[PDB]
Amino acid sequence: DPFDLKRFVYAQAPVYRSVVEELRAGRKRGHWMWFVFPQLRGLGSSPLAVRYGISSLEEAQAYLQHDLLGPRLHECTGLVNQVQGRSIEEIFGPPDDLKLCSSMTLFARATDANQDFVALLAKYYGGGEDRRTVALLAVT
Template sequence: MYNLQRFIDAQNNGHAYETALREIKNGSKNTHWIWYVFPQHVALGRSSMNAKYGITCAKEARAYIENEILRERLLEISEALYALPTNDPVSVLGSVDALKVRSCCTLFRAVAPEYEIFDKLIEKYCRGIPCADTLELLKLAT
């Protein structure tokens, strides 16, 4: 139903996922991969990359996390980000991509609460405050 292969293809292209993981483990994002490694809701961005890799709804996000390859990679890179000694996401990701990761974690925390890493990242890097825009888009805002 959802074209999840677009994420796998992008992550495999030129070893983009391995590059992303290495950069996170080294504590500094230097190349362009955020859209297809930490996807956010499509309505939160205006770029062509966000249009291509944005998640359209909660069901698509759930399908993403249920895909074995995408789940394993998202959990692995999220754990690597969490393991860094810093509490400042901007120092690792830059200001724009730090917001995208916050949105991504909010999205997946909402649709897959069984994976605690997303809540842990929001606690560590966002003072426990999820992305309100993502929650509203998912109609989960309280």
């Protein structure tokens, strides 16, 4: 576990069922964004944001390969894509709307098998991407 992906598994454990239920119902309520829809380290500055920040594109790729975390991320993305009639700010109150954009932008760049991540950006963000994430990913 060279990237310490276990940190995400253990953070998710106490809350994951509630995450699924909240996303199934179309509204986030709990305190879990950082380790459910991870974003690049350096975007947020709080100890939580830093701890659960993704270090690099290579870590994002490892995250996707992980047979618990990858499927869970697709599950959570798919649940959001399934919600009807709500803007993203109705599902994820600010600043979590920006966090989600950053997460989808990162994982869309991590793999070409990104249809769900890109679909979320298309549906909810006008096909736009997180500016700061694209910049941080430009150079390896």
